[PDB]
């Protein structure tokens, strides 16, 4: 054996330090550990697409929960906060509902005033002057 491997101990511990919190022999035996440490790393990067998915689904379920307290549905709140050019995203709107429920009651009041201004413009077809909260601000 001219040169055989003298540092094979440290190549095993590169993998086995990630497996210390496993079950069974996956935390000890190297042959069983690499098929799970690799699989624990692929799931770690495929769940960067699911954290952003499961946070937005959580924010939608926390805006839908709080908009129902004021009688609004979720598409009646997001759809009419856009129309008032109030570009708040789902993270803040779900964190306004928990920590500032007076401001969230004002955003539910505003998104329902614009909704009623959208119906009153739609039942009165033909040229009518616009609503007060329905006037867009133009940028040039």
């Amino acid at each position: 054996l001219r040169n055989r491997v003298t540092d094979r101990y440290f190549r095993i511990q590169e993998v086995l330090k990630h497996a210390r919190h496993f079950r069974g022999r996956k935390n000890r035996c190297y042959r069983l550990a690499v098929r799970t440490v690799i699989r624990a790393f692929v799931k770690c990067t495929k769940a960067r697409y699911l954290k952003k998915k499961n946070m937005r689904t959580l924010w939608i379920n926390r805006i839908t929960a709080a908009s129902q307290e004021h009688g609004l549905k979720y598409p009646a709140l997001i759809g009419n906060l856009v129309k008032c050019q109030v570009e708040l995203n789902r993270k803040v709107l779900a964190d306004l509902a928990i920590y500032e429920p007076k401001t969230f009651k004002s955003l539910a009041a505003l998104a329902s005033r614009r909704r009623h201004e959208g119906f009153a413009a739609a039942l009165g077809d033909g040229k009518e002057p616009e609503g007060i909260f329905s006037r867009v601000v133009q940028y040039h």
């Binding site: 624990a40 920590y99 500032e100 007076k102």
Partner: protein, 148 residues
Amino acid sequence: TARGTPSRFLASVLHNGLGRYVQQLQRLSFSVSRDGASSRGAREFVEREVIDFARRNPGVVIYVNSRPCCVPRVVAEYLNGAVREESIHCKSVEEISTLVQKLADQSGLDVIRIRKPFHTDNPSIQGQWHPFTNKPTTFRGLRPREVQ
């Protein structure tokens, strides 16, 4: 991964930005070989830019030890007692000058996973939601199906 590695919350040391900004390095400690190719860039860092560095922040007290080592180390000690010992082994002069400026900018808190990207200590101003916000009160406190 994140279930293997510890985690912490985003904090500062002593509310580092409220009153004044306190530089969080105390010491840098360079071991630099006099004869040795591994510390070729580390000798050029001490010759050129450690004097420009030791004037840019006079709170950091820098010790160049200059002993016969094979691997040159830099031992950054911080204000909360933490020690981050890193190696500058076979690095060019432009690669140690950013490695040391990275050591100056950061605080002594661990580089483990930070849970939330923010830290409010008074998160609520109008009063945090409980189930009895957004619920109207009945007359006399009468619960449903209660006659008197």
